[PDB]
């Protein structure tokens, strides 16, 4: 299992514009298009992202391409972030994937806001960190996915994904 297969399971794949759990326009493997209510503003961002007139529909290759860009951007955002970088450097390979998953879903800013949990992770206080991570809007809104990520942080194995 790796970051790509993990996110593919959490996000799914859809070749037509759809609305995410928050009601925002999305396409492919969790690629957010816009927070704007306009389906036309979405089609426009999509065409811009792909470099062609898509009329709201993309192929599997196009989806994978966006996905490779998004995972790359998530890692690079973590490495450039003064709050995230030290956390990431301290973790083993599996737990690193867990942190990447949160950043992809919520953005660097949002994750950097989990101050207390980040501190606990750095200190390798696994159980404590899992409890603090659960007291969040994130856990209450997307409980099955949050449990999977949290278990990954608690155990350091891919069990939740098998």
Residue 145 contacts Cl ion per CB under 5 A: yes
**Are the beta carbons of 33 and 17 closer than 8 angstroms?**
yes
Report, in Å, the least distance between residue 33 CB and Cl ion: 9
23, 51, 92, 144: residue in contact with Cl ion (rule CB under 5 A): 144
Residue 81 contacts Cl ion per CB under 5 A: no
Report, in Å, the least distance between residue 76 CB and Cl ion: 14
Residue 44 contacts Cl ion per CB under 5 A: no
Residue 64 designated active-site = no
- What is the Cα–Cα distance from 103 to 30, expressed in whole angstroms? 12
In order of 26, 31, 38, 136, the CA distances from 11 in angstroms are: 11, 9, 22, 20
Residue 7 contacts Cl ion per CB under 5 A: no
Residue 108 designated active-site = no
* Residues binding Cl ion (CB under 5 A): 49, 142, 144-145
Catalytic annotation, residues: 11, 20
């Amino acid at each position: 299992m790796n970051i790509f297969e993990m996110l593919r399971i959490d996000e799914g794949l859809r070749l037509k514009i759809y609305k995410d759990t928050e009601g925002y326009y999305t396409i492919g493997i969790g690629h957010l298009l816009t927070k704007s209510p306009s389906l036309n503003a979405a089609k426009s961002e999509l065409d811009k992202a792909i470099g062609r007139n898509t009329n709201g529909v993309i192929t599997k290759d196009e989806a994978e391409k966006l996905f490779n860009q998004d995972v790359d951007a998530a890692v690079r955002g973590i490495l450039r972030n003064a709050k995230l970088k030290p956390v990431y450097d301290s973790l083993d390979a599996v737990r690193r994937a867990a942190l990447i998953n949160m950043v992809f879903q919520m953005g660097e800013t949002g994750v950097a806001g989990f101050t207390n949990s980040l501190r606990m992770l750095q200190q390798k206080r696994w159980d404590e960190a899992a409890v603090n991570l659960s007291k969040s809007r994130w856990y209450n809104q997307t409980p099955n996915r949050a449990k999977r990520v949290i278990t990954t942080f608690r155990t350091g194995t891919w069990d939740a994904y098998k």
